[PDB]
Amino acid sequence: GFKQDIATLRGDLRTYAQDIFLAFLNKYPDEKRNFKNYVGKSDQELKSMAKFGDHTEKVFNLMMEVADRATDCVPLASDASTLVQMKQHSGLTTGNFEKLFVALVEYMRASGQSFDSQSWDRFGKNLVSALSSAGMK
Ligand code: HEM
Ligand SMILES: CC1=CC=C(C(C)C)CC1
């Protein structure tokens, strides 16, 4: 289930984080507008760039904490506020988070592995709901 999936992803997080974020950026290429250091790069090139691996690993470090602290895939209101209020998320709307979770569920469904992709799809929706109620546009 979801709790075990948090453990699996944490067991190889740097790699999962890169592969999932790359799936997100390739699936929705316009989402690179938020990450202009990443334009005109292959996946292998991005995996060589220090802030791509650093920032992506910190994104998924926090995403796993939020997941871990959820009840029935519903994140804490304090976690949604933190995500809204972050200055690096000034630009952002719930559409950006929706697309990130579409890509994460698709990755999970295409993997050889017994991830609970239904739980992750609900977590994504529930997180977008929470981000809306915390005041993200
Ligand atoms: C649950 C989902 C997400 C979590 C947990 C999260 C978390 C974080 C964290 C921890 C950082 C700081 C990274 C660092 O500087 O070391 C960060 C930065 C940032 N995040 Fe998010 N984030 C999420 C979703 C998104 C989405 C969907 C977007 C845009 C589509 C986004 C855009 C950014 C940007 C632009 C930065 C700063 C520039 C950069 O790090 O490249 N985030 N995020
Ligand atoms: C904060 C942040 C999120 C995502 C990335 C890519 C490299 C995954 C870097 C910046």
Cα 59 to averaged position of ligand 1 atoms, centre (Å): 6
| Enclosing H/E stretch for 88 | none
Tokens linked to 21: 């974020």
| Enclosing H/E stretch for 86 | none
- In the chain, the number of structural domains is 1
H runs (alpha helix) in the chain = 2-10, 13-27, 43-48, 50-69, 77-85, 94-110, 117-133
Ligand 1 atom having least distance to the Cα of 37 = 41
Resolution of the structure, angstroms: 1.7
Cβ of 59 below 6 Å from ligand 2: yes
Experimental method: X-ray
Rg (CA), the chain: 14
Residue numbers of the domain that contains 61: 1-137
Q: Whose CA is nearest to atom 17 of ligand 1?
A: 59
Rounded Cα distance, 98 and 13, in Å: 21
**Residue 106 near residue 53, CB atoms below 8 Å:** no
Q: Characterize 53-84 residue by residue with b for buried, 16 or more Cβ atoms within 10 angstroms of its Cβ, and e for exposed.
A: beebbeebeebbebbeebeebebeeebbbbbb
> 135: how many CB neighbours lie within 10 A of its CB?
10
Beta bridge partners of 135: none
**Residue 106 near residue 23, CB atoms below 8 Å:** yes
Q: Taking the CA atoms of 85, 29, 49 and 7 in sequence, report the sign of the dihedral they define.
A: positive
Mutation probe of ligand 2 site: the residue of 13, 16, 21 with most atoms within 8 A of C-beta: 21
Write the single-letter amino acid at 64. Answer: M
**Ligand-binding site membership of 24 (annotated):** no
Cβ of 18 below 6 Å from ligand 2: no
